[PDB]
Amino acid sequence: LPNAEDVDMPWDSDVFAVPSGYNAPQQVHITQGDYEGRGVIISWTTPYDKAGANKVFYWSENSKSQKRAMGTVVTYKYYNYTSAFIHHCTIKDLEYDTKYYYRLGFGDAKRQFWFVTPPKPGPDVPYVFGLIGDIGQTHDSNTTLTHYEQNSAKGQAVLFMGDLSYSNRWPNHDNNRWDTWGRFSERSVAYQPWIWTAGNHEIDYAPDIGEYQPFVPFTNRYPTPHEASGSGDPLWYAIKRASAHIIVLSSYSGFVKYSPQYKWFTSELEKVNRSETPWLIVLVHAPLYNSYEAHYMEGEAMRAIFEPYFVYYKVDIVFSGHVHSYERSERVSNVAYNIVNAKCTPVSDESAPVYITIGDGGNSEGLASEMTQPQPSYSAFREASFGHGIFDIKNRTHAHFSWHRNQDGASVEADSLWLLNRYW
Amino acid sequence: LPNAEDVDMPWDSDVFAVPSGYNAPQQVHITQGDYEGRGVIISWTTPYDKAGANKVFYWSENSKSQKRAMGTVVTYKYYNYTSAFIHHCTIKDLEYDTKYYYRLGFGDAKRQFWFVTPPKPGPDVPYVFGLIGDIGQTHDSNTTLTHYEQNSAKGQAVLFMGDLSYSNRWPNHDNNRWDTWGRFSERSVAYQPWIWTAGNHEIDYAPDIGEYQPFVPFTNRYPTPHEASGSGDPLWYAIKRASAHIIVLSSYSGFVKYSPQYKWFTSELEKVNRSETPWLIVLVHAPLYNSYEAHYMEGEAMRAIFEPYFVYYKVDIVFSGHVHSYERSERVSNVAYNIVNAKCTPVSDESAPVYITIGDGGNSEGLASEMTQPQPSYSAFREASFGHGIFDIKNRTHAHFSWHRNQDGASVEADSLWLLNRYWAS
Ligand SMILES: *[C@H]1O[C@H](CO)[C@@H](O[C@H]2O[C@H](CO)[C@@H](O[C@@H]3O[C@H](CO)[C@@H](O)[C@H](O)[C@@H]3O)[C@H](O)[C@H]2NC(C)=O)[C@H](O[C@@H]2O[C@@H](C)[C@@H](O)[C@@H](O)[C@@H]2O)[C@H]1NC(C)=O
Numbered sequence: 001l002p003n004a005e006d007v008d009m010p011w012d013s014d015v016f017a018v019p020s021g022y023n024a025p026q027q028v029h030i031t032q033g034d035y036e037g038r039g040v041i042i043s044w045t046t047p048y049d050k051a052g053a054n055k056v057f058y059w060s061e062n063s064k065s066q067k068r069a070m071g072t073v074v075t076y077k078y079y080n081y082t083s084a085f086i087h088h089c090t091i092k093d094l095e096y097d098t099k100y101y102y103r104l105g106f107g108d109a110k111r112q113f114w115f116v117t118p119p120k121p122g123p124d125v126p127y128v129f130g131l132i133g134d135i136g137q138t139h140d141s142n143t144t145l146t147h148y149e150q151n152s153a154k155g156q157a158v159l160f161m162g163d164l165s166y167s168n169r170w171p172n173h174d175n176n177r178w179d180t181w182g183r184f185s186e187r188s189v190a191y192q193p194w195i196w197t198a199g200n201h202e203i204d205y206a207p208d209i210g211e212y213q214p215f216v217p218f219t220n221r222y223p224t225p226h227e228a229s230g231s232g233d234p235l236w237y238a239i240k241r242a243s244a245h246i247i248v249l250s251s252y253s254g255f256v257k258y259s260p261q262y263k264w265f266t267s268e269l270e271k272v273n274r275s276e277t278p279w280l281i282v283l284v285h286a287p288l289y290n291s292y293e294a295h296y297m298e299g300e301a302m303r304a305i306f307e308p309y310f311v312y313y314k315v316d317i318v319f320s321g322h323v324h325s326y327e328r329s330e331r332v333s334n335v336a337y338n339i340v341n342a343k344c345t346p347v348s349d350e351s352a353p354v355y356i357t358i359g360d361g362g363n364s365e366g367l368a369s370e371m372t373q374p375q376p377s378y379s380a381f382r383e384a385s386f387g388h389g390i391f392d393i394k395n396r397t398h399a400h401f402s403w404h405r406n407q408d409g410a411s412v413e414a415d416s417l418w419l420l421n422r423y424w
Numbered sequence: 425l426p427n428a429e430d431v432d433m434p435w436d437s438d439v440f441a442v443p444s445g446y447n448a449p450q451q452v453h454i455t456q457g458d459y460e461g462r463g464v465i466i467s468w469t470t471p472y473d474k475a476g477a478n479k480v481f482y483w484s485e486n487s488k489s490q491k492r493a494m495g496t497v498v499t500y501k502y503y504n505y506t507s508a509f510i511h512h513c514t515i516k517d518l519e520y521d522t523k524y525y526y527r528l529g530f531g532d533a534k535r536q537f538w539f540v541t542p543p544k545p546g547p548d549v550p551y552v553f554g555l556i557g558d559i560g561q562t563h564d565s566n567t568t569l570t571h572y573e574q575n576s577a578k579g580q581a582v583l584f585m586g587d588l589s590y591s592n593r594w595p596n597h598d599n600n601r602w603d604t605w606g607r608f609s610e611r612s613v614a615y616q617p618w619i620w621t622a623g624n625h626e627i628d629y630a631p632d633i634g635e636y637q638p639f640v641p642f643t644n645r646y647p648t649p650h651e652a653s654g655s656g657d658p659l660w661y662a663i664k665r666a667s668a669h670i671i672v673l674s675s676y677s678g679f680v681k682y683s684p685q686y687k688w689f690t691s692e693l694e695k696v697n698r699s700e701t702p703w704l705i706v707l708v709h710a711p712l713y714n715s716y717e718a719h720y721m722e723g724e725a726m727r728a729i730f731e732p733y734f735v736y737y738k739v740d741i742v743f744s745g746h747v748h749s750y751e752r753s754e755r756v757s758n759v760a761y762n763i764v765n766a767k768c769t770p771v772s773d774e775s776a777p778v779y780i781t782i783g784d785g786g787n788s789e790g791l792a793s794e795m796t797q798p799q800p801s802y803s804a805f806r807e808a809s810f811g812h813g814i815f816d817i818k819n820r821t822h823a824h825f826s827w828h829r830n831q832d833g834a835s836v837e838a839d840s841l842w843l844l845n846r847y848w849a850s
Pocket residue numbers: 080081171
């Protein structure tokens with residue numbers, strides 16, 4: 001309630017159409033493949049594993065000669081479900097700020113796409129990031145995506161806050177709905193990388209049907225550039241793109257002191273260089289600050305361990321999803337507590353980041369309407385409406401954030417904020 | 425912090441001696457194998473995997489007819505280390521409260537041990553649990569264990585709070601020190617089950633030497649009865665023994681709402697029956713209450729999510745380690761906070777368990793001496809001294825806890841508390 005089977009787009013929806021041709025490459029998507037940006041991971045799925053299905057042809061537009069690469073293939077099973085042949089190809093050492101064309105398939109199944117590598121990492125290098133979370137595959141989900149595509153701000157990459165397909169809401173977590181989501185999202189992710197964050201809907205824990213190990217479907221379908229970041233797990237990693245250093249954290253993985261993620265995270269903080277990448281961005285599914293009734297305080301555990309660091313290294317902004325609505329905080333912190341002093345009230349803090357909740361992509365569960373009352377002072381803006389966001393970096397000191405509602409024009413900003421870098 | 429290579433017992437120490445005979449079964453240890461208690465998991469390691477090395481012969485003291493079982497074998501690698509053949513045999517459906525003999529090996533390598541299954545689960549069934557945490561393999565570690573063995577209270581099983589071998593403190597986490605620890609602890613774990621709790625020293629995360637996946641050594645050496653508990657992971661599970669229902673949690677695994685462990689834990693709480701097993705015990709490595717300087721507030725994250733439940737289901741007592749010293753709290757809680765009300769002060773709460781910190785088994789890192797000041801009211805007793813503890817269940821309403829320091833006689837109690845069950849005496 002709402003029932004996924006009643007609100008998600010129909011199986012026959014155009015957006016779920018299978019590309020024609022024998023063994024057509026489908027569910028095509030890419031993501032950054034290296035730490036610097038001249039890398040990419042291209043993913044595509046094929047119903048059969050026959051000669052040719054595992055090859056990518058790519059080439060810069062202003063350089064005729066085309067190179068070919070082979071992917072690594074995998075398949076997985078989940079209850080009575082079996083995947084097709086999933087290919088993942090990691091291409092490195094490309095050129096910065098250059099358009100590339102790549103194609104999959106052969107005969108009349110051949111498909112061509114393109115993408116643009118980001119400019120070399122630098123302090124004043126501008127870049128426009130799209131912001132989406134908890135999209136799923138409902139009719140609202142389609143609207144949200146449509147609006148992002150038409151947004152005059154022209155996003156070059158999407159920072160995704162978690163909860164991709166919501167297929168776990170179907171009987172037996174029907175993995176066929178992961179495939180549909182793959183076809184649906186392809187029109188975007190096939191052209192610009194989506195930087196993944198794992199949400200609780202990617203856990204896919206189902207003892208009832210004998211599936212006790214989490215993230216099996218997600219981990220097999222959406223690889224991450226964790227190794228290049230120094231992480232031995234795909235759920236947590238970091239990349240550098242343009243003037244930003246992005247750290248993606250995992251809400252449902254262990255994160256207390258001494259845990260692998262914690263050790264990786266602290267080391268990563270020390271690798272950050274604000275002189276090269278001014279904008280320090282963090283992604284986590286569950287918000288550390290949320291004043292909505294839904295999932296209220298669920299992020300308290302992580303806030304206890306990580307907030308102190310967010311503030312010490314001066315993260316500029318933190319993006320989260322999970323709560324199906326929108327919210328933006330004031331720069332605040334609650335890191336003075338030691339039990340005895342009883343100091344447990346969030347206070348204005350210019351060394352703290354702005355906290356964003358954008359889990360309103362439109363998944364089947366619907367909007368999270370009820371809010372705590374009255375509005376806490378740490379909250380600057382909160383509205384329950386589907387939409388997407390934009391983080392527009394202009395230079396080392398300015399970046400413009402904005403929220404776009406589906407009721408409004410793709411370019412209309414219902415809320416926005418000009419951020420001043422915390423370091424410059 | 426002290427150098428492990430300078431304080432841990434020497435490689436040639438008697439306590440590390442390899443049993444004689446061809447392919448001698450070594451590093452023998454057992455733990456409960458089922459949910460009820462009539463189960464056991466026997467583990468032993470053999471340098472070679474030849475016919476016979478994978479068989480256990482076991483029988484009742486009363487019987488003369490001995491049974492035989494085959495184990496499941498595994499080996500693992502860690503950096504430039506390779507394990508021998510590790511065997512794990514899960515024997516089920518034994519008889520309650522009966523002594524059993526079992527033997528491994530052949531020829532003059534043959535070795536015999538014994539253990540005693542617990543009595544059938546019941547409200548007034550008495551039982552004595554030993555308490556140890558962060559023991560490691562130093563000379564103090566040996567003393568601690570010796571004292572437990574001589575303790576007139578006669579513990580029948582050991583609840584272990586985490587951080588077993590501390591071999592990760594040696595160069596490259598030298599897994600050879602896991603083997604030594606296995607021989608050292610054997611004199612006890614081979615006769616009475618140790619109920620494992622995973623500590624940060626079992627994480628064995630070492631990117632520097634290309635080991636990114638945690639718990640590899642621990643998970644391969646010390647199996648857990650998680651499946652019989654409904655858990656798909658060895659780091660978290662529950663068992664019933666005598667009058668107690670024990671829930672073992674994992675501090676370094678995900679534990680927030682919606683996580684596998686969290687879902688397992690909440691379901692497990694609903695399976696608890698205080699009319700069958702009065703004593704609800706919880707084990708976690710990192711203490712939710714600790715007033716020592718070391719690791720101060722490290723357990724705050726878990727307290728935020730789990731404390732509310734500990735109080736609602738009235739856990740009787742919670743045992744932890746991690747802090748190398750001893751501490752016992754008053755029955756308190758801090759579950760009223762909602763941000764806005766600013767209610768963040770621990771307050772006296774008779775519905776809350778007593779929190780115990782016994783990570784003073786004696787590992788190489790030494791004692792955690794500095795304490796926060798002055799002593800917070802939620803703390804009833806705190807002392808930095810090596811030792812072990814005893815949880816003596818007498819009946820559905822009374823259970824006696826006591827702390828034993830290595831400076832004192834195995835039986836001397838430097839601290840103690842008579843607990844009143846929260847369900848039948850509170
Ligand atoms: C693994 O097992 C699944 C068990 O749920 C199965 O789901 C389907 O199971 C049956 C078999 O097709 C479907 O059909 C109904 O079955 C009942 C049996 O009592 C019968 O009386 C009805 O007349 C009706 O035919 C179920 O509808 C369905 N489960 C549900 C409710 O979603 C999976 O197989 C499936 O079979 C068909 C339903 C296909 O259309 C797919 O849904 C699927 O293939 C099976 N795994 C797979 C291959 O998905």
